[PDB]
Swiss-Prot record:
Protein name, per record: Autoimmune regulator
Function: Transcription factor playing an essential role to promote self-tolerance in the thymus by regulating the expression of a wide array of self-antigens that have the commonality of being tissue-restricted in their expression pattern in the periphery, called tissue restricted antigens (TRA). Binds to G-doublets in an A/T-rich environment; the preferred motif is a tandem repeat of 5'-ATTGGTTA-3' combined with a 5'-TTATTA-3' box. Binds to nucleosomes.
Full-protein interval shown: 423 to 485 of 545
Disease implication from the record: Autoimmune polyendocrine syndrome 1, with or without reversible metaphyseal dysplasia: A rare disease characterized by the combination of chronic mucocutaneous candidiasis, hypoparathyroidism and Addison disease. Symptoms of mucocutaneous candidiasis manifest first, followed by hypotension or fatigue occurring as a result of Addison disease. APS1 is associated with other autoimmune disorders including diabetes mellitus, vitiligo, alopecia, hepatitis, pernicious anemia and primary hypothyroidism.
Domain commentary: The L-X-X-L-L repeats may be implicated in binding to nuclear receptors.
Subcellular location as annotated: Nucleus; Cytoplasm
Effect of C18P: Reduces transcription activation
Length: 66
């Protein structure tokens, strides 16, 4: 219906900065739960192409495919 996301509170996965897991973002390269602004408060823009946590955003160098 419209209440399948009622328990959006990930088990053992919440924004450590807030304590809440309400509308918490997930990492695509690993498993994580955080709010973008809570991890990247430097004015970093949230990418729609691959949500990346702090660790996964450390080294991001793609392989030049020709
Ligand atoms: Zn937060
Ligand atoms: Zn990650």
């Amino acid at each position: 219906g419209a209440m399948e996301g009622q328990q959006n509170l990930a088990p053992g996965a919440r924004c450590g900065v807030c304590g809440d897991g309400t509308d918490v973002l997930r990492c695509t390269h690993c498993a994580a739960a955080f709010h973008w602004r809570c991890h990247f408060p430097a004015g970093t823009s949230r990418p729609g192409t691959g949500l990346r946590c702090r660790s996964c955003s450390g080294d991001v160098t793609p392989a030049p495919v020709e």
